[PDB]
A paper describes a structure:
The integrated stress response (ISR) is a conserved eukaryotic stress response that senses and integrates diverse stressors and responds by reprogramming translation. Loading is catalyzed by the guanine nucleotide exchange factor (GEF) eIF2B, a large decameric and twofold symmetric enzyme that is composed of two copies each of five different subunits, eIF2Bα, β, δ, γ, and ε. The eIF2B decamer is built from two eIF2Bβδγε tetramers and one eIF2Bα2 homodimer. Upon ISR activation in response to a variety of stress conditions, eIF2 becomes phosphorylated, converting it from eIF2B’s substrate into an eIF2B inhibitor.
To this end, we prepared the apo-eIF2B decamer by combining eIF2Bβδγε tetramers and eIF2Bα2 and subjected the sample to cryo-EM imaging. After 2D and 3D classification, we generated a single consensus structure of the apo-eIF2B decamer at 2.8 Å resolution with most side chains clearly resolved. This map allowed us to build an improved atomic model of the eIF2B decamer. (E) Local resolution map of the apo eIF2B showing that the peripheral regions of the γ and α subunits are dynamic. Regions close to the core (chain D, on the left) are well-resolved and have clear density for most side chains; regions close to the periphery of the molecule (chains A and I, middle and right) are less well-resolved due to higher flexibility. Closer inspection revealed that ISRIB slightly draws the decamer's two halves together by comparison with the apostate but does not induce marked changes in eIF2B’s overall conformation. In the apo versus the ISRIB-bound state, eIF2Bδ L179 shifts slightly into the pocket, occupying a position where it would clash with ISRIB binding, and eIF2Bβ H188 (a key ISRIB interactor) adopts a different rotamer. Overlay of the apo decamer with structures of eIF2B bound to one or two copies of its enzymatically engaged substrate eIF2 also revealed unremarkable changes. We infer from these results that all of these structures represent, with the minor variations noted, the enzymatically active state of eIF2B, henceforth referred to as the ‘A-State’ (‘A’ for active). As indicated by the structure of the apo eIF2B decamer, the conformational equilibrium in the absence of ligand likely favors the A-State, which is further stabilized by substrate eIF2 and/or ISRIB binding but antagonized by eIF2-P binding.
Numbering used by the authors:
A (entry chain D): 8 to 98, 125 to 351
B (entry chain C): 168 to 351
C (entry chain A): 41 to 279, 285 to 459
D (entry chain I): 1 to 10, 24 to 60, 85 to 135, 157 to 235, 297 to 334
E (entry chain F): 172 to 517
F (entry chain E): 167 to 517
Amino acid sequence: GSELSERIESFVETLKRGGGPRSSEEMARETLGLLRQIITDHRWSNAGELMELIRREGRRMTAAQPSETTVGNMVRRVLKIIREEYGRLHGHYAQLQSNIIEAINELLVELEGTMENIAAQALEHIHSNEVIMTIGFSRTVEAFLKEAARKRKFHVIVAECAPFCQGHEMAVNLSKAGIETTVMTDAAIFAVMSRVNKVIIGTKTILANGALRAVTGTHTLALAAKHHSTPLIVCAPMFKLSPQFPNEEDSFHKFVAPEEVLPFTEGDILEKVSVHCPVFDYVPPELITLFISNIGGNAPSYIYRLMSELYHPDDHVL
Amino acid sequence: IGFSRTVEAFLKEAARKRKFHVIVAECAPFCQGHEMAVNLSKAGIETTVMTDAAIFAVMSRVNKVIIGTKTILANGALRAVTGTHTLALAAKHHSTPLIVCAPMFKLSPQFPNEEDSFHKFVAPEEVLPFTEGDILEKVSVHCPVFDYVPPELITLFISNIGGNAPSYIYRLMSELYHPDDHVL
Amino acid sequence: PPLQAVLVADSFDRRFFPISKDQPRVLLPLANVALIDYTLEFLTATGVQETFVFCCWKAAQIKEHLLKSKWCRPTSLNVVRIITSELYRSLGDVLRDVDAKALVRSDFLLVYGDVISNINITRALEEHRLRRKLEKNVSVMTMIFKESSPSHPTRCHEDNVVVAVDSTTNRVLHFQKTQGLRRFAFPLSLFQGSSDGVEVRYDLLDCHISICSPQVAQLFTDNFDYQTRDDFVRGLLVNNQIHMHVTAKEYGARVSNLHMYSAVCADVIRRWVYPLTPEANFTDSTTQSCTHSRHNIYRGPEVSLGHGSILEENVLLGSGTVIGSNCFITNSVIGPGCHIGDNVVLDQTYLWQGVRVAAGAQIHQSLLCDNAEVKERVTLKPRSVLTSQVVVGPNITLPEGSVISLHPPDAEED
Amino acid sequence: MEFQAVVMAVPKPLLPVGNKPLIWYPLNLLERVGFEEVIVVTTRDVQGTADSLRYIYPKLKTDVLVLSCDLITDVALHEVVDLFRAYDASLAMLMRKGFIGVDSTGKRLLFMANEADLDEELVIKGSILQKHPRIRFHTGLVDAHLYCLKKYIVDFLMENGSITSIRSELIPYLVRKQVRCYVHIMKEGLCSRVSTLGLYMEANRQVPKLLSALC
Amino acid sequence: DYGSKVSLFSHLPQYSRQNSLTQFMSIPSSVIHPAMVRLGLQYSQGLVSGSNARCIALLRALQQVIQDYTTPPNEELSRDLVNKLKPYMSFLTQCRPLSASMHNAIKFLNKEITSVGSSKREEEAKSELRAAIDRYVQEKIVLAAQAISRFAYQKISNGDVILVYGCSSLVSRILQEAWTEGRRFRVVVVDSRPWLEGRHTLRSLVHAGVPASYLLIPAASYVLPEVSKVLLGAHALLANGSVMSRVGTAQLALVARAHNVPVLVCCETYKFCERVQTDAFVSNELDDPDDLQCKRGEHVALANWQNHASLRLLNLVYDVTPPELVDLVITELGMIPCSSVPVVLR
Amino acid sequence: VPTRKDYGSKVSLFSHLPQYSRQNSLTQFMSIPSSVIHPAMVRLGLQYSQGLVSGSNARCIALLRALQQVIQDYTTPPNEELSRDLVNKLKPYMSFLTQCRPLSASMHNAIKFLNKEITSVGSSKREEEAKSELRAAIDRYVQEKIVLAAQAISRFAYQKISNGDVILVYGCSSLVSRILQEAWTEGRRFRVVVVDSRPWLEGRHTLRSLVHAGVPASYLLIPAASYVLPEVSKVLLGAHALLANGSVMSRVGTAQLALVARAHNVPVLVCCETYKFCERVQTDAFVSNELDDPDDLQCKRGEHVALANWQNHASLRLLNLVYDVTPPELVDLVITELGMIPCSSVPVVLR
């Protein structure tokens, strides 16, 4: 299947060059579709060959971009599906393909439904005349906020990100719905984190110990929340949950060109000054209050069980 | 919490130019907070009334705490009405400021000795009525009016000479009383 | 119409001379990786579908290096084509030959084989086509410039230029270099005809990337004494219009001389050309993998770091390089298969593959090429370049700017 | 007493522009905002610029604000006086559109050549470009001939009386060089100076719309 | 609704005790079952306020309703009964908000009813439903307290000073069973206004022979220094480890932690809900505001509080305690941590 | 003098703090030959509004020079006492300068000192004597409170900086820059880490100053402070004011940095003089702060501005804070010209 190899190479290049789709849901859906296509257009007799081929492909896709913790999750999910199916049929080498495809489709439809599954739980935690603040821009949190703005009324404060000011789009989108949102810088968090009653944010990846690898600036927000004793909620689907711990990992953050921090038109001082631009950061589990998932809320202390349920322990290394 | 004329004046002096929401926690033995809430609402301040048990579950949307006291000790601590200790604990847990509106005459040079005569014990009629029955003979009821509030839970002291911190009350004492007349 | 470009993988200018005698300019390892690899990756990432690689000086090595590379694989979307010839003497001859062969069809890019950039050209190319379609056959070229500071180390005097363009519609009205000249002259025709919105720009870095048109090759065939691009622009401005496109959030620079070489290296190691970094391994090679750690320290496989040495700043160690004990390396690029001694200070040094440095050596701001060797108690000064396969005896102190080569007349012989 | 007003008139100022004296419009511009004093240098019958300025040197003792004999403009003087106040500029001028080398920000004056002086082309120095790599050149604008000048500039003009018609001799020398010169361009104002017949008729036609607001 | 609610508590119903919902209904209740009608009337009037007593009364009323339920023709009962029980639950909620115990119980009853197939007869189905309700009660309420009584007996020592709060049918039983086994300790009963339900525990302890003390909650910081343990009862255990109990529990646990006293919690497994909560603002219950009125001195100060349009009277009932203040939880399965509720829910 | 007009929609919590825009000026409705306000005061107000002079000590120095000029150019009226003449004449100038931009604690302290000195002027001395005495006292104050205090603070802090240390600064503080310069000149070998924040972007000032001095400085933004603190060993910070309760009313982004440092176990130091100590108290940044121009928050990302027209949305608010307060429990020690004192000794110095 040379066309399959071409699609795989294009995906790897767009992921390593400038990333795939802009939102994480589309990224996960495209990864799962590519995995389904690989499973369909390929020859194999035993499940071991298929699973090791998928392992190699996922290893390649992860080496293309290690900071994109959305494709490895789909690869591990497909591997777990294959293993569960093989154990159910053997606990087999002629009709294992169609059932894998059916399972993958079942996973796809719920992948799409995750957004509504999350947004439906907005009225359980938001009350009238509440003061909530957020940082960055996330579709999940945007829906979670604008879904309860029809019957409930509250105040929203959006803190922009210094390297890439992405909170402006979120503030504009929330103001278009009439939620009385306010815009501020990421340097006035602690200054205003005294009249706030709750915090809701979105993350990029959930580690195994209940930690978050979100955009740079959320660790300080969590520290200020824990100092002021304000519940900090994280709304993230299950595909943003990886079986890896904070340490035991190099290249945790993503370092981009210093152009966003210090422009190229400064002068000669750029030869002496050393500039670093981290995109993500690490947030320990002790500063998290609740996890709003597709299966309802959950405390940070109950993430290991979801890990054991979703992924296989032998597939953590991949 | 409670009823304090100084705190009442401090609150109603800002209502004429500002709009805020005042929460008042009554005192279980002598429910004097109701009178304060009524006198405040008489001026249109949007007050509220509640019991002492609802001081922590409700103190998550509060931003500032302003209370009075019976006297200020030497190490910054003070003797306030019962239940003020839980209020200060909740304030420190939520990292909210705790302002103490007390004049200068409420400053005592005595230190926190083991404080046996610190609390004022009154008849148990307020806590448990006499019409309960025969269980009053084998049940010990205690009704302490005052309590001890450490200084670490306090944040500021507003007096007639300007706001100060708890760590500076020793100088005010030295300026007010002589160290030889501390025991009297 | 698929976007196609022309790559001149030979700079007939000889600035790296003596170094360009044994090994081409466009295959000099910058960060353990050739320059033509950077250029091909830029073209493949910007949307180019076909390239024409022209080589005259040492073309055999260029082609036989490219044929192992990943761009010539059947799985590459940018099919490259190597055209070698011994008649070419300047860029004008290359364009003349293209016109003779009728290779190009549409708006093509003209870039050298030593251009490092991460610029995206979709925007500029749209502007070019729309502009040509409002004035049929009027706009002929679009030169890309990167706005910078006149203080920047990357801005060498040899490439420094000053432009006087119109601000209403970006259009080049005057273009001239500033090499060894202190007060600039701008003719009065600019204000004579039009250009109410005319302004002089001195904050621009010539990326040498130009979106050309077939009419460019036509005019190059008409005028026989057009030997380069600069003269094409000067001779067209005395008389068609040439426009620009300025970038502020992307990087682009051309390696023209030695001083320019050490300027892009620091930027590439410092991630200024993201995504193009040593950590990314954009060549799909096995001998260039590394792991990026704090302070932009890159470590490959089998680094064999000795106890005591301290990596303080942006360094890049190769695969197989051996480091001794109690060393100090900073801002230094080490190649694969290097092997250092003990008590070795490296400050802004570029060591290529196959180098051995003995113990007690102190090297500062100088470049060691392939198979170089220095004995004990040797100290090299800034700009003290050693070419291929030289050996420096012990207890020697080379002056600043000293050049040692095994060819007799190249420089101070071994 | 921050600024002192001076207007030279060396008839022209007696032209009935809109049935009113032509010299009445400049004086009205120097009115409605303090300005209880204004120095006029008109002839005896009226009931170079550098020479006339130095002829009254011992009279002025503060920052000077020189105007033209006739200058009809509906601009706010603060717009041009802010450049002299905030930036502590040594020279502040006003003009309107129809090189001058105004910089990018549109206020700092960098180049003030004239077509008569230049030989064939425009010569520019390297240092001035090193400091400012962008020089916005204007050619069609008109010079209103009004400047807010400091006192030490007048002292320098006095100590050497070899300068005449500051408009073409002092301003270029000041721009050529710490000295600080700034310009303000309206792009939407009237800024009409009566020098020829065309401008005279244009001012006569524009008078009514201005007098409707003035009186 | 009755009276003006609070701005921050305007999304919850505030009913009254004098305003009865049986006014606009037929004396022989047609649309609503008489048993459920009297049950809702008792809930509204406060005749049954115990967490477990409410559930027991609800289940007995449901058994009575099922005993006299006739399945119409042209349809199965496995679905008709579920469709008919919904308006009864709606009416009960209108009378007084339901508790987590009642929610779990009605959920179990609906599941059991759905588990009944139309293949079976009506009488057999009704008998099986009655027996199922009976044994479920016996297991999750009766037998679910004997194991907790012998598990907490280990953590009780001679000379202990146990501190309790409010009224709980399980804490009193635990103490009365530990006293008869041989333990010799003394209990401190904390109470709060306006319910003053701690007097129930005080009397139940005095009648048992355990030395007991009584004081209001504002003085909890004065007696805690001499307290060795704090045994508390709750109404529900959330899935995030938190505990839902009476309003005067969170601050009590806070002061206990400040005084370095280990806090405990005793709850039945059937009270393990699946939802989560972070504070007492998103889901609470506002009872009649006139309960705060008190005859202090010569007259009442809140006799005509409604005349003051700016004055509000908050009467919260429940509260949510964070897992950071709970050390141990006692159940029939054994002693588990505060952060192991989901494991039991599994 | 007319009152300045607000701009845009303010926040519900900051409804009591004025909010102006630097695009409009207050001199538009005033005379060019200023009649009620002194010309120097008008120039100073313009410089404050346009953001030309934004330094903590630079503003006070400019105010003192303008006051010297005013005292030099003014003459007392007949049959009028001198001690109250200058106070009554300065009363409206402070109003105008506050309308242009809210005065800082240093400016308030300088004004109080000048009023004290003016009231201390005798009744018998003539005009020239009193004017010269005031003009001399002003620069004596400038010398004994700014430059000499800075030298003393640098001398006291030099012993705290050691070789191999890593200092983390924030914003633009002339005192910290001078301290670092003197430390590097005295032989100390260290490296600084500059932390900046939008939209002012003033950390580049200290960055280029250190680069001119030769210190291996580093640059990064405030959201990434949690990434570089694990390697930082000291945090030097500047203070715009120190209240009576031992709280630092410095730049908005200072309390956050101090909190993150304390969370990362990094001792934070605060440099401040004795002339910035005011006899007032503030517990939070809400009750007292300054709202700068909100139009500075919008930026150009990509090729379009997300906040190009923010006033169109009737439910969109822009908050541009300047200062903030930090509790005393976050500052370890405060370096002053009277020796190293803890954060619990501000009233001792104020006494």
